[PDB]
Amino acid sequence: VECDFSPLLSGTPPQVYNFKRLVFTNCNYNLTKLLSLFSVNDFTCSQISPAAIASNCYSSLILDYFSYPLSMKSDLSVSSAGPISQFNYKQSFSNPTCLILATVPHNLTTITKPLKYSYINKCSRLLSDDRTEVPQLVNANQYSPCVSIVPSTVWEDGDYYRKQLSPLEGGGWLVASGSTVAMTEQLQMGFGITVQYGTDTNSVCPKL
Amino acid sequence: SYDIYDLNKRQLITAERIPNDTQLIRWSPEGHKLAYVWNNDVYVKNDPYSPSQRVTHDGREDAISNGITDWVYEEEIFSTHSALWWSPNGTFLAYAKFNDTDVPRIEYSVYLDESLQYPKTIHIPYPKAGAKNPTVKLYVVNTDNLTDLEPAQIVAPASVLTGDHYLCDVTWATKERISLQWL
Amino acid sequence: RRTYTLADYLKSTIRMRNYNLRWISDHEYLYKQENNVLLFNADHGNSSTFLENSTFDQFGHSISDYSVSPDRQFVLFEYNYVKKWRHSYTASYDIYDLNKRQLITAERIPNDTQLIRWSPEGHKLAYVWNNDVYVKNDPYSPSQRVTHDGREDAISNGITDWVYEEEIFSTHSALWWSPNGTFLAYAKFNDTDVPRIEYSVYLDESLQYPKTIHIPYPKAGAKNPTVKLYVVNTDNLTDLEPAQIVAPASVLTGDHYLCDVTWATKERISLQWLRRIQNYSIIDICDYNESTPKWNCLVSRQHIETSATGWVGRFKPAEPHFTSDGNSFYKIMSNSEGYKHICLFQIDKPDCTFITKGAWEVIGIEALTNDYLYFISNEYKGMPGGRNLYKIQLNNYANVTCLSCELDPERCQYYSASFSKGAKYYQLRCSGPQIPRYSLHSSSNDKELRLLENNTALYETLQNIQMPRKTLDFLHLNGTKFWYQMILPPHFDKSKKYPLLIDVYAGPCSQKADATFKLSWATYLASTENIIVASFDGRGSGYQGDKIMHAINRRLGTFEVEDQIEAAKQFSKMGFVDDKRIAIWGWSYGGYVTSMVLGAGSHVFKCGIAVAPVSAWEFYDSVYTERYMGLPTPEDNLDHYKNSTVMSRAENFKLVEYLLIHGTADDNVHFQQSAQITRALVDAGVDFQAMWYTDEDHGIATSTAHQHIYTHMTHFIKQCFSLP
């Protein structure tokens, strides 16, 4: 049929730690048609080339999209140990991944801006000892546990959040701190593609 | 107000002066780098003959203070108005950010000289027992390359993020290591 | 078949394209396409859109220029451009941060800023404002004022005055960054006692009273501005005062010029000084002695250049091109036979070693690596009016390899090149004599990577037009070969006799006859009015040896005039040129020659046009004038200053038709000059024509004025040649 990118062009994009995900199977995509709606600043792919990602067939294609400032581009590397790939968002190494940083042009008005870019710069857990800290590093293709206590948009750089764990849930505390980066004139976003290969389901091909 | 007196020329510096109504000022541990607080913002001067670099820009009286203590911190914790901590090389600067926005304020009248026809009311953020206490945040700034890398906050340990907390002491171990006492 | 009409020249109906790029790496360049700025990588052929035209008009206003930082982190946007002079202006600049992709709002760059230059590496800025030098270690960092004596028409720090911008630097800039960006070299000019030229500006019909414009302009022999060279450490600017580099003693015997400042290494600076009597030039090599810390300019590395037959260099001494280690350089110097060739200097050695020779000159040095040196020469086919790219092996000087000779020998005989860093690739530009062309080459194998612009649209558009032809031929005058060119009408018939029109510059080291392709006014005359337009490079011309060039020395208006007449006499001997329909015209030196020709009493020319002519060398600036004519003192050369005035030749103007044109806002060739002519023509009972162009500068170029003067001159020539 046709891969529906409509959820990506409508509404307010989530923050990096609350990233939205579009899973694509049994459809036909035109990558260049989508990236022609944006102002693509950086396009870096792992185990695959940006020319191949738009022209090859996969059994399943994942597209994580979220709001992300271009200033912190250095922190979206999966090799980095910074408070983005530590607590907010991480791509898997076991499959070809691509990373797209875009800029919402003036003539793309169906994407609303938030007050500011926000990100979790600390998410650890306090055990019942009340003495031991255990940083909750985020795993690939999963959310950070601290999104239960970190709001959809951090109010102020430095605001901390706390939640007391029930004994069944491990006891102690779940503790997080947030940070912010001031909004740009045009909303800068980040896209993360991740492709997967299955036995017979090679059903995500570029259209003709 | 502070003047700068150059000893190499034995002359008074007249350009790029230090503003009147400056609240705090501290040399670096080595060299001649200055850091001062003016309108509750932190300013740094790599050299007396050098323009000031504004580090923070949210300084608001009785709400936000950068580099200077509030009342309870000065009286009961720091025993000093200062919240600037230089790096031993002068490379880094650790400054504290206080927020008394929702801290209740005491009001008392001042009956100045017989000239004053109406008594002044003085407001002071003063957390009494159980009241909203000020917050504190610790930020560190590289003086030598201040242009990029907006200030880096050193978040408090998790053991202390269970609720309200204080910041008691900031000491420098080495040129790249810093110690923070939380409570 | 259609012809090249006058409207085709004045309306730019037939546009010729080009391909202008900026190398920002050893393998990457920026190019503006569809108002977008594309970033091309020559190592892979891939190109990305570096700067959307969307982010050019969404600021508040129209942006005139751009300059991307060498680290590609910031972009300067120029707007509110207000023209000052030839190369000068004042405008406001914005800084666009590419890391945030956001516009910078704090610590901005002031309005009315005169100059601005990035550092060679990184993102440091240096600008000139109110004739003072300011530095910004970072766009997000306050400005540091370096100098504080900036006085209009008195003191300029970092920007040139008028004569330096016009006659020496050919740029308004007097800032020189060091390769690391640590040091800044700036020049301080002092026009306090330099006399002023004053002319009125009759602006828009609203202005009730005219404005009087004042410009420090030293005329021949007048007080000249001084220059001082100061260097400043950017990394510790608040430690010492700016360190002056005193000029060498050889140049301190009187007035002197500063003509070039080049950086050899990160701690070595080279200064080219010139005496006021321009036959003595010296290079001083200065190293930074971190101890005191001063700039140590050892005497044993002073390098002198002189001339016995006249002045040094073509217009000014050649600039040195230092090697990668800054312990040697190659610079163009005249050999014993008087031909500009490449000489090899060692910093500490007192003599240089010539690496090229022949009866041909080197135009310039284009690029330099450790193994090859790239340059332009007029050697191919022994034609001085040609330009081709060569390379020299630095081990075997005998192994010279031309890179442009055999590419398209019939279409392209006039090349130029723009190289990248380290000469990894180079852009080739062909200028004629057929349709121009632009190509990208790699220096590893000198193979064309891709064709950038072929002007194919121009090619087919001329196919439908009876275009004239350009002949490169020569003749002999007193046994010396002399080249000339003819624009021949279409369907040229040597049996028929055409009218002749001579285009003149005849300036020192000029060259009007060359293998260049132009859509000029002469193209119109030949293609439409069937007039032969010729130009002759006689004595005083350049690129043919110091013998021919320096023949005019101290004798301006003597041999370059006779040889235009004498060559015109030769053209009459030919069977296709009407003896009674020969004319002449020039501009700013042709106007001098054209005028001086009509006053010779030659009975060769029927009419003439002088556009912004020089009338007496007493009236032109000292840098250009004293270089060829010396001082107007009874002890140096006052005799020929007087013997060479156009006014002395008024009576012989009774025999020709004189048309004199001059703009009023001319800051280069003052309206005073043409006025003195008419006074000599009026006082002598001589009738003539004149036409002023109000508020037009020297190179009359306003769309309304450009069309008017040529439409006026067309009517004049057609009336002089008895043409429809």
Ligand SMILES: *[C@@H]1O[C@H](CO)[C@@H](O[C@@H]2O[C@H](CO)[C@@H](O[C@@H]3O[C@H](CO)[C@@H](O)[C@H](O)[C@@H]3O)[C@H](O)[C@H]2NC(C)=O)[C@H](O)[C@H]1NC(C)=O
């Ligand atoms: C300084 O302290 C004040 C007060 O402690 C901070 O302002 C307050 O911030 C809180 C949240 O941190 C705001 O409370 C509520 O936030 C929820 C979020 O869901 C919102 O839905 C409510 O409408 C409400 O706003 C509160 O409004 C706000 N008060 C103000 C701005 O007056 C302030 O952020 C602190 N500043 C710094 C630099 O630490």
Ligand SMILES: *[C@@H]1O[C@H](CO)[C@@H](O[C@@H]2O[C@H](CO)[C@@H](O[C@@H]3O[C@H](CO)[C@@H](O)[C@H](O)[C@@H]3O)[C@H](O)[C@H]2NC(C)=O)[C@H](O)[C@H]1NC(C)=O
């Ligand atoms: C820019 O150039 C002007 C003039 O070219 C410089 O000012 C002039 O400086 C000279 C001396 O260098 C002054 O001349 C005489 O000096 C003798 C010294 O014995 C004194 O006795 C005389 O009374 C006379 O002053 C001259 O007055 C002065 N003219 C001025 C100031 O208008 C000026 O120093 C140069 N500035 C720079 C920055 O290069």
Ligand SMILES: *[C@@H]1O[C@H](CO)[C@@H](O[C@@H]2O[C@H](CO)[C@@H](O)[C@H](O)[C@H]2NC(C)=O)[C@H](O)[C@H]1NC(C)=O
């Ligand atoms: C003061 O100390 C700091 C940190 O110890 C120095 O900064 C580092 O210096 C080393 C060399 O000793 C460099 O390799 C690093 O790149 C520097 N990093 C940073 C973040 O500055 C600084 O140079 C020292 N300065 C003085 C005057 O002693």
Ligand SMILES: *[C@@H]1O[C@H](CO)[C@@H](O[C@@H]2O[C@H](CO)[C@@H](O)[C@H](O)[C@H]2NC(C)=O)[C@H](O)[C@H]1NC(C)=O
């Ligand atoms: C740019 O070059 C200058 C001079 O080469 C450097 O300045 C010197 O740097 C050396 C080490 O590279 C030090 O030992 C000296 O103390 C420096 N002296 C001075 C006067 O600067 C400068 O550090 C270089 N900067 C960069 C960014 O490469």
Ligand SMILES: *[C@@H]1O[C@H](CO)[C@@H](O[C@@H]2O[C@H](CO)[C@@H](O)[C@H](O)[C@H]2NC(C)=O)[C@H](O)[C@H]1NC(C)=O
């Ligand atoms: C540069 O030119 C000047 C004049 O054009 C030369 O000055 C001559 O100097 C000698 C002294 O050796 C005098 O005897 C002459 O009378 C001077 N000539 C004039 C016209 O004044 C000067 O020699 C030239 N320099 C060089 C290196 O050739």
Ligand SMILES: *[C@@H]1O[C@H](CO)[C@@H](O[C@@H]2O[C@H](CO)[C@@H](O)[C@H](O)[C@H]2NC(C)=O)[C@H](O)[C@H]1NC(C)=O
């Ligand atoms: C580039 O333009 C030139 C014209 O200057 C083209 O060369 C001509 O090609 C025609 C083919 O129809 C030949 O008949 C002419 O003899 C050629 N003229 C010259 C001077 O070479 C050339 O084909 C163009 N190249 C491209 C790739 O468009």
Ligand SMILES: *[C@@H]1O[C@H](CO)[C@@H](O)[C@H](O)[C@H]1NC(C)=O
């Ligand atoms: C995909 O989109 C690009 C963008 O213009 C277009 O050129 C191409 O034809 C499209 N392909 C298909 C199969 O629609």
Ligand SMILES: *[C@@H]1O[C@H](CO)[C@@H](O)[C@H](O)[C@H]1NC(C)=O
């Ligand atoms: C801007 O660039 C785009 C790129 O294709 C082009 O289509 C458009 O015409 C350009 N607009 C202007 C005003 O140059």
Ligand SMILES: *[C@@H]1O[C@H](CO)[C@@H](O)[C@H](O)[C@H]1NC(C)=O
């Ligand atoms: C060209 O390709 C190389 C490697 O694929 C890449 O690093 C470079 O960024 C590309 N050029 C541009 C302008 O992006």
